[PDB]
Amino acid sequence: TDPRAKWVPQDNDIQACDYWRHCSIDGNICDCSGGSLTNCPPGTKLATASWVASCYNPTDGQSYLIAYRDCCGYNVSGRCPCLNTEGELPVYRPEFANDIIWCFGAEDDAMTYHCTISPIVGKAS
Amino acid sequence: EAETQAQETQGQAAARAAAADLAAGQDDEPRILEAPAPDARRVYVNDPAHFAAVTQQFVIDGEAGRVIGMIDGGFLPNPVVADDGSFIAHASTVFSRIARGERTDYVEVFDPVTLLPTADIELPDAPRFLVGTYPWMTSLTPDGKTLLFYQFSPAPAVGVVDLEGKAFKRMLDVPDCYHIFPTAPDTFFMHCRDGSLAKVAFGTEGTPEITHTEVFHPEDEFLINHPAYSQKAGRLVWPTYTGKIHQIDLSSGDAKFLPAVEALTEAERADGWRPGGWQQVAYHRALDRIYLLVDQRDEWRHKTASRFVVVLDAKTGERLAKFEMGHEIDSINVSQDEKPLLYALSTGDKTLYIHDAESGEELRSVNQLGHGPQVITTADMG
Amino acid sequence: DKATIPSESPFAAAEVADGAIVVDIAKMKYETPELHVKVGDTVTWINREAMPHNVHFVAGVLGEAALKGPMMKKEQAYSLTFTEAGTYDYHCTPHPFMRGKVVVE
Amino acid sequence: APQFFNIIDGSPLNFDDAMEEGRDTEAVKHFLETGENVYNEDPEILPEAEELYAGMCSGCHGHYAEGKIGPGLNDAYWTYPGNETDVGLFSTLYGGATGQMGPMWGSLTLDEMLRTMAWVRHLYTGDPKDASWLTDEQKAGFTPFQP
Ligand code: HEC
Ligand code: NA
């Protein structure tokens, strides 16, 4: 598969990098290290702040706003790595930038990157 | 594991010498080597290792295609190299229990030959901005006596570290701007959210002088995170997602905006060509040329590797050449000497390909460079 | 010390008392940038857009420590009761460019 | 004909309280009949509209309606949803909202309210396509406000 080709979302496997909610994920899918699609793995710290992205859901044809909160305080999982950038903007537009470690707000001031969750926070455009 | 033609030649030459030395009755007497003196062909490759807690930097002789040394780093360190080759340093982050516990942000300075640390400066209150490695989020002033680093939260600010006195000085409050481009011992520019550039003049005490330039690009034009900046020429080369290039001349001390040029031809843009990668642009000072990583790709695949590099005259915007790299390249940079080498780093192959910057021909390669190498740094010793 | 937290976690905006001092958050901004209130008043922030936001006061503003309010989703609220007179600046954690101010008189 | 109701309690607005002066203009008559404010983006009334806003509204809503001690009025968000239409905006000024934002019929003539409204619309910083209070021709010449 050509990495430069237009990204095509699917809604049948959350551990694959083309799962629709991962349209702007950067790092690793938490479900592959003990977490779930929207929950952090045991022992890690859940961030409160994050970058977001409007991802298209091929199932219902609607676009949802996904909040890419990172699970922190652990070394990177190394499992299910992915990097998608649908609508991702440069660092001077942080609200949509994904190279930033979005660990702010995590308990114990944890700032190391372990994995990222893909929860829906609302409908987008 | 797998040997490149270059390391294969080195390995053979070394075996030849060991065998000959043995036969001639020479004895082995182990010692610690010193790296060869820094030169125009030395190149540094940093491995952020896909956000791992610990990282590595490789010191490479670009001429021979040989690793001459290494440096250990913490979480997402920011590397800097003195243009005069007198030292190398990095802003780094470590924790008491691998990835958790007490966090310590610090700056380490290294001897360019022995690679031993000559300074270890702790940064109060863990002020480092943890983000994918952007070369210009941590910079050296032209005199090499000061290091400046960026803080994102809780408020935009730039830390001042006195490398001469080996001590942290103070945090400078700045507007909502990003990146740091030093032009003098006490002055540096930043790029702001409103599209303007901010000139910041500071001192040992007092609030800094901040002045904004005119807005040089609209809200819908996106400037990449990896612009090329030549401190010796005071040239800031900033590409956009489409390949349009904004050049700023800071050599006078104030920002002078040069005419924007399209790095891609009319036909290429119509055929879907766009720049893409990590360090997508490179600038050669002496030749006044720009190198840009490009390929055919969808508009939102701007961080994927590219297989081509286009070269253009920075003064006129004239297309000089287009190279087929033959590999998935993520970052590029060039040596700053007379006959430059074109460095092409592949994160996926964890390999540094070394090409002739003029013909685009691949000369040699160095593999096994960590887990996810992404940043190339060279010194402008001219 | 200078403010109390009526609720640690954000609540439905529907629970917001009628006629309460409210600061709406929408279009990447606190709609009322310089709110003036009297000592004892309870200020309530309500996020009106999908984009999550919060209020964040750096250390030394409301107390010795900083106050990193929880992130509010669309139609969620968070309150703070100011006990001391003075001016209090705040911003949104992930969006440092978003700034607001509360003036207690 | 538009329905003019108090935006808070939904009661019918009483135009009998309106000042006698300024209820005769072509603008007012057209507005009461269609709910359309012909002063929007009208170069000939903008200068005065700006003066009206400056003396009567800027103190609370900001020099450019970006908001100050009172809420901003220059973007697509409205506490009272009906304010995205001129009938709603008018109703807010005439009948008042809550707190210090009270009825303006005692200080502004019907015509002055429409002119003041035109300036508020002129300060919009949103996308022209989203200015439903503007005609197609007006949208074509509209540019989001900038200080
Ligand atoms: C301070 C004493 C004010 C002056 C003078 C003006 N306004 Fe105002 N306005 C004020 C407040 C405190 C509020 C919030 C009221 C509430 O019930 O929440 C408002 C509100 C408005 C609105 C509604 C905005 C919305 O989001 O729906 C509008 C359209 C408005 N104000 C307009 C307006 C104009 C045109 C004024 C000059 C004649 C004006 N206001 C003055 C406080 C104050
Ligand atoms: Na508004």
Q: Which domains does chain B have, with CATH numbers?
A: 1-382 (2.130.10.10)
| Cβ neighbour number for residue A71 with a 10 Å cutoff | 28
Closest CA to B183 of B249, B265, B279, B267: B249
Amino acid at B224: I
Helix (H) or strand (E) holding B148: strand B146-151
- Say if residues B214 and B272 touch (Cβ distance below 8 Å): no
Q: Amino acid letter at A48?
A: T
Q: What six digits make up the tokens of C29?
A: 């901004």
Among B51, B130, B191, select the one facing A27 at the smallest CB separation: B51
- Torsion sign over Cα B65, B66, B68, B72: positive
Q: Whose CA is nearest to atom 5 of ligand 1?
A: D57
Contact B80, B89 (CB under 8 A): yes
B/A Cβ contact: 3+ pairs below 8 Å: yes
The angle, 0 to 180 degrees and rounded to 10, between the axes of the packed helices D26-34 and D110-122 is 80
Count other Cβ atoms within 10 Å, centred on residue B98: 13
Q: The domain that contains D9 carries what CATH number?
A: 1.10.760.10
- Which among A67, A105, A123 is the nearest to C93, CB-wise? A105
Within 8 A of B152 by CB-CB distance, chain C residues are: 96
Q: Which helix (H) or strand (E) holds A53?
A: strand A51-57
Task: State the residue range of the domain holding D98.
Answer: 1-147
Which among B178, B168, B179, B170 is positioned nearest to B202, based on CA atoms? B170
What's the token pair of residue B53?
């807690």
Q: Reduced to 3 states, what is the DSSP secondary structure of residue D17?
A: helix
Question: What 3-state DSSP class applies to B283?
Answer: strand
Helices (H), A83-125: none
Closest-CA residue to B243 (of B196, B178, B297, B204): B297
Task: Enumerate residues lining ligand 1, CB below 6 A.
Answer: D 56-57, 59-61, 70-71, 73, 78-80, 83, 89, 92-93, 97-101, 104, 116, 120
Rounded Cα gap, residues D92 and D103, in angstroms: 8
Q: Which of D16, D34, D19 is nearest to D110 (CA)?
A: D19
Find the Cα–Cα–Cα–Cα dihedral B293, B296, B299, B302, rounded to 10°: -30
**Would you state the torsion angle of the CA atoms of residues A34, A36, A41, A46, taken in this order, to the nearest 10 degrees?**
170
Please count the structural domains in chain D. Answer: 1
Both structure tokens of A66: 């996904």
Written as six digits, the tokens of B201 are 């003049």
Which residue in this structure is represented by tokens 């390999």? B351
Count of domains forming chain A = 1
Name which of B195, B209, B363, C6 is nearest A90 in CA terms: B195
**Which contacts (CB < 8 Å, 24+ apart) does range B6-12 have?**
B6/B64, B6/B65, B6/B66, B6/B364, B6/B365, B6/B366, B7/B65, B7/B66, B7/B366, B7/B367, B10/B64, B10/B66
Nearest beta carbon to residue C58 from set B154, B176, B193: B154
Give burial (CB, 10 Å; 0-12/13-18/19+) of D146. exposed
- Kindly state the tokens that stand for B93: 């982050």
The alpha carbon of B195 and the centre of ligand 2 are apart by a number of angstroms equal to 24
> D103-110 — which CB contacts under 8 Å span 24+ positions?
D104/D56, D105/D17, D105/D18, D105/D19, D106/D17, D106/D19, D107/D56, D108/D19, D108/D52, D108/D56, D109/D18, D109/D19, D109/D21, D109/D22, D109/D23, D110/D15, D110/D18, D110/D19, D110/D22, D110/D23, D110/D25, D110/D28
Ligand 1 centre to CA of D60 (Å) is 7
Residues 6+ apart with CB under 8 A from B16: none
Pairing state between β B100-110 and B88-97: antiparallel
- C32 closest CB neighbour out of D70, D76, D98: D70
List phi, psi (to 5°) of B7.
Answer: -70, -25
CB B168 within 8 A of CB B124: yes
DSSP code string of C25-50: E-SSSBSSSEEEE-TT-EEEEEE-SS
Backbone angles phi, psi at D113, to 5 degrees: -60, -45
Query: Hey, are the CB atoms on B225 and A91 less than 8 Å from each other?
Result: yes
Task: Give the HSE-up count for residue D62: Cα atoms under 13 Å, Cβ half-sphere.
Answer: 19
CB spacing of B100 vs A92 below 8 angstroms: no
Chain C residues closer than 8 Å to D62 by CB: 33
Cα distance between residue A72 and residue B202, in whole Å: 36
Orientation angle between helical segments D110-122 and D46-56, nearest 10 degrees = 100
Residue from B51, B86, B46 nearest B70 by CA: B46
- As a whole number of angstroms, the distance between CA A79 and CA A70 comes to 15
* Helical packing angle, D110-122 and D86-95, nearest 10°: 130
CA B190 and chain centroid, separation: 17
Residue C65 contacts A where some CB pair is shorter than 8 Å = no
Ligand nearest to the CA of D75: 2
CB contact under 8 A, A5 and B297: yes
Gap between the Cα atoms of B82 and B111, Å rounded: 11
Helix or strand holding residue D52 (H, E): helix D46-56
Question: What one-character-per-residue DSSP string does B288-336 give?
Answer: TEEEEEEEE--TT-TTS-EEEEEEEETTT--EEEEEEEEEEE-EEEE--
Residue B10, classed as helix, strand or coil, is helix
Closest Cα of chain A to B296: distance in Å? 7
Q: What is the CA radius of gyration of chain D?
A: 14
C39 touches chain B (CB under 8 A): no
Please say if A70 is a catalytic residue.
yes
Distance from the alpha carbon of residue D115 to the mean position of ligand 1, in angstroms = 16
R_g over Cα of chain A: 14
Give strand pairing partners of B237.
Answer: B228, B247
Tokens 């060991």 belong to which residue? Answer: B18
Domains detected in chain C: 1-105 (2.60.40.420)
CA-CA distance, C91 to B154, in Å (whole number)? 9
Torsion of CA A65, A68, A69, A71, to 10 degrees: 150
Return d(Cα B217, Cα B151) in angstroms, integer. Answer: 24
Residue B238 near residue B314, CB atoms below 8 Å: no
Neighbouring residues of A65: CB distance < 8 A, sequence distance ≥ 6: A52, A53, A54, A55, A120, A121, A122, A123, A124, C50, C51
Question: What are the structure tokens assigned to B293, written together?
Answer: 């990583």
Distance CA D82, CA C6 (A): 32
CB D116 within 8 A of CB D46: no
Q: Could you tell me how far CA D53 lies from the centroid of its own chain?
A: 10
> CA-CA distance, B183 to B232, in Å (whole number)?
9
Per the structure, the complete domain to which residue A2 belongs is given by 1-125
Question: Which one of the listed residues B58, B75, B110, B308 is annotated catalytic?
Answer: B75
> Residue B290 region, left (φ>0) first, then alpha (ψ -120 to 50), else beta?
beta
Q: Using DSSP bridges, classify how beta strands B187-192 and B197-201 pair: parallel, antiparallel or unpaired.
A: antiparallel
SS3 C7: coil
Q: Comparing C-alpha atoms, which of C47, C44, C103, C55 is closest to residue C79? A: C44
Question: Cβ contacts (< 8 Å) between C56 and chain B: which residues?
Answer: 154
Beta bridge partners of B343: B333, B354
C-alpha closest to that of B222 among B300, B331, B323: B300
Q: In what order do the strands lie in the sheet with B100-110?
A: B78-81, B88-97, B100-110, B117-123
Tell me the two tokens of residue A120. 């829906």
Q: Which of B152, B176, B219 is the mutation pick for testing C, counting most C CBs within 10 A?
A: B176
CB A15 within 8 A of CB A31: yes
Q: Which residues of C touch B171 (CB under 8 A)?
A: none
Which amino acid does the sequence have at B121? I
Q: Find, in chain A, the residue whose alpha carbon is nearest to that of B74.
A: A112
D48 token code pair: 């005065």
Q: Report CA Rg, chain B.
A: 21
Mutate one of A24, A46, A48, A70 to test the C interface: name it (highest C CB count within 10 A).
Answer: A48
Chain C residues close to A50, C-beta within 8 Å: 52, 94
What's the rounded Cα separation, in Å, for the pair B251 and B181? 12
The answer to whether the Cβ–Cβ distance between C71 and A102 falls below 8 Å is no
Decide: C71 and C54 in contact? Cβ < 8 Å.
yes
D30 is in an annotated binding site: no
Atom 17 (ligand 1): residue with closest C-alpha? D98
Cross-chain Cβ contact B154/C97 below 8 Å: no
The percent helix, strand, coil of chain A (3-state, each to 5) is: 10, 30, 60
**Would you tell me how many other CB atoms lie within 10 Å of the CB of residue A119?**
16
Which residues, 6+ apart, have CB-to-CB distance to D43 below 8 Å?
none
The C-alpha angle with vertex A103 and arms to A102 and A109, in degrees rounded to 5, equals 155
Secondary-structure breakdown of chain D: helix, strand, coil percentages, each rounded to the nearest 5: 45, 0, 55
Residue B47 near residue B70 (C-beta atoms within 8 A): no
Element (H, E) at B244: strand B244-249
State the Cα–Cα distance between residues A109 and C8, nearest whole angstrom.
18
Cα(A15)–Cα(A30) distance, integer angstroms: 9
d(CA B9, CA B229): 36
Element at D114 (helix H, strand E): helix D110-122
CB contact under 8 A, A121 and C94: no
Q: Which residue of A has its CA nearest to C74?
A: A122
Contacts with B52 from chain A: Cβ below 8 Å: 75-76
Closest Cα to residue B77, out of B17, B135, B12? B135
Output the DSSP codes for B79-142. EEE-TTSS-EEEEEEEEEETTEEEEEEEEEEE-TTT--EEEEEEETT-----BS--GGGEEE-T
Peptide bond into B154 cis (omega under 30): yes
Structural Rg of chain C based on CA atoms: 12
* Cross-strand partners of B212: B198
Burial class of residue B203 (count of CB atoms within 10 Å of its CB; 0-12, 13-18, 19+): exposed
CA–centroid distance, B148 to ligand 1, in Å, is 46
CATH number for position A63:
2.60.30.10
Q: Binding site membership of C for Cu cation: which residues?
A: 53, 92, 95, 98
Chain B within 8 Å of C58 (Cβ-Cβ)? yes
